[PDB]
Design a protein around this ligand. Structure first.
Ligand SMILES: OC[C@H]1O[C@@H](O[C@H]2[C@H](O)[C@@H](O)[C@H](O[C@H]3[C@H](O)[C@@H](O)[C@H](O[C@H]4[C@H](O)[C@@H](O)[C@H](O[C@H]5[C@H](O)[C@@H](O)[C@H](O)O[C@@H]5CO)O[C@@H]4CO)O[C@@H]3CO)O[C@@H]2CO)[C@H](O)[C@@H](O)[C@@H]1O
Length: 338
């Protein structure tokens, strides 16, 4: 009745006060993504005590006491003066949506109104403060409250809204109804060579900016795109189109025995070998049994230690899924394995 990988994650990465820590950074930071992944994982493990502890810290330290009053700051850590506090109060929307989804699902599954209430308020503020109408697209999720929108151009992060979460959110009406559709557009239209970019710009009157560019590569952010798609139920009509679009990533992995570290989105040219986390991300994504098993071996033989926040978090999701630790319904709900 425990999720061993999660139990080890708590010991190595989660403080007594409930903050998820990336030890690789000298400021020993906590991110809103980290908190949301901890909430998700706690929920999947049926670990309410940890869910509550992580939620408390999040509200108190990232939201000045309340997720109903503001989106959580994305970055928290040690300052030069020795004080520990928010380092950037801007939000990161991937943490935000995962946080809202976990909360809403915690409310439903544990039958607790307080989680629903916080989840709803959070989701509404997301829609109001980091969702905007873009000419040529309609409603789009910005990667954050500020810094990603100019008068005539926007920058998006395809990895931020998993299609399952998008589907889940539709039950709440506008603008989520539309976002589920524009999210598909973002994912399908910006992968000309079958690789999703970490970041991608859109300009009014011109459209997607898909010429070769520094951040127009499939690396640490984008690797999650393939994982989210693989986590979609077969009965999600969007899944087939997405698997087809991203096939060259599956083909590369099968052929080379590993996922690439970086891929030029405009040319499809690959470089390096991705870390163990990337292999975990492939487990739900790859449909070929043998290829799946090759990645499974790599995760097993190079399982992340205590000095590897990102690999570990990818592993919780990827290997977690490979081990039936959680599943998503056709409506984006958590089907728990408790
Ligand atoms: O140049 C114009 C004007 O202002 C200054 O330039 C601006 C620039 O125009 C803005 O775009 C830029 O905006 C940045 C935000 O201030 C900053 O908060 C945001 O930080 C991101 C961060 O980049 C990103 O890594 C992080 O993502 C997290 C996600 O959860 C996941 O992807 C994963 O977990 O990785 C991380 C950590 O977990 O999110 C944060 C928060 O959204 O980045 C914006 C873009 O860089 O600000 C500049 C300065 O204000 C310029 O200096 C002036 O001269 C000029 O007049």
């Amino acid at each position: 009745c425990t999720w061993p990988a999660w139990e080890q994650f708590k010991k190595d990465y989660i403080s007594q006060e409930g903050r998820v820590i990336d030890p690789s950074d000298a400021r020993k930071i906590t991110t809103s993504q980290g908190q949301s992944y901890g909430m998700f994982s706690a929920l999947a493990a049926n670990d309410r005590a940890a869910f509550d502890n992580i939620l408390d810290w999040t509200q108190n330290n990232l939201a000045q006491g309340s997720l109903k009053e503001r989106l959580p700051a994305w970055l928290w850590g040690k300052k030069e003066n020795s004080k520990w506090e928010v380092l950037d109060s801007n939000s990161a929307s991937d943490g935000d949506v995962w946080m809202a989804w976990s909360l809403l699902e915690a409310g439903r599954l544990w039958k607790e109104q307080r989680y629903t209430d916080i989840g709803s308020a959070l989701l509404k503020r997301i829609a109001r403060e980091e969702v905007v109408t873009v000419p040529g697209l309609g409603s789009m999720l910005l990667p954050g409250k500020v810094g990603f929108a100019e008068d005539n151009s926007w920058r998006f992060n395809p990895s931020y809204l998993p299609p399952t979460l998008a589907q889940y959110f539709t039950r709440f009406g506008a603008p989520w109804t539309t976002l589920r559709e524009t999210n598909q557009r973002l994912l399908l239209e910006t992968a000309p060579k079958g690789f999703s970019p970490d970041w991608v710009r859109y300009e009014k009157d011109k459209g997607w900016q898909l010429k070769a560019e520094k951040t127009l590569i499939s690396s640490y952010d984008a690797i999650r795109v393939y994982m989210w798609v693989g986590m979609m139920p077969d009965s999600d009509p969007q899944k087939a189109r997405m698997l087809n679009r991203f096939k060259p990533m599956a083909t590369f992995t099968e052929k080379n025995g590993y996922p690439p570290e970086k891929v030029d989105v405009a040319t499809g040219k690959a470089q390096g070998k991705g870390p163990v986390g990337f292999s975990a991300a492939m487990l739900p994504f790859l449909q070929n049994r043998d290829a799946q098993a090759v990645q499974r071996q790599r995760v097993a033989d190079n399982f992340p230690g205590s000095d590897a926040y990102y690999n570990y978090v990818l592993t919780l999701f990827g290997q977690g899924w490979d081990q039936h630790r959680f599943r998503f319904s056709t409506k984006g709900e958590l089907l728990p394995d408790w």
